[PDB]
Design a protein around this ligand. Sequence first.
Ligand SMILES: O=C(O)c1cccnc1
Ligand SMILES: [Zn+2]
Length: 173
Amino acid sequence: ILGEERRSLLIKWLKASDTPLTGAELAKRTNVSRQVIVQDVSLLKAKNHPILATAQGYIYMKEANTVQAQRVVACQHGPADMKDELLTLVDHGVLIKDVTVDHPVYGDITASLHLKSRKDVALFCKRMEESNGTLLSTLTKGVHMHTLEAESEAILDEAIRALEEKGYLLNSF
Ligand SMILES: O=C(O)c1cccnc1
Ligand SMILES: [Zn+2]
């Protein structure tokens, strides 16, 4: 009963929230561990709840008041330019929805980043360097995909052109 009560609260809180809720926050609200929250959300996903774990916390997927522009972008940068690439995108008001790496063993690996602010980017880059941080390894020579989302196609164009000026796009060859 208590586990089902806890998961009912998680759904309520995620539906009411306009921002990601960290596993740590959800764990503190329910007196469990972040690991228990992982298991709760896993069970909810198997019940077809569209809950996504992002780099900033859990979100319940729903639609916006205006339909946003979206684009798949092929990128490439050196092993020290991740923070500058991501900051360039959020500074143009672009949501960095995900990143995909073409891994020789796993195939395409996609992480739901949902980076939106400078603080999102700074905290994510710090946490990845403090861990193993090998999602964008020497395996693809920095080549990777992003799904980007913005209010207009004009805004995506300016952000993508800002990537090219820094040499962060995959050069058609
Ligand atoms: O965009 C990048 O460079 C990136 C994003 C997530 C993880 N590693 C690299
Ligand atoms: Zn990138």
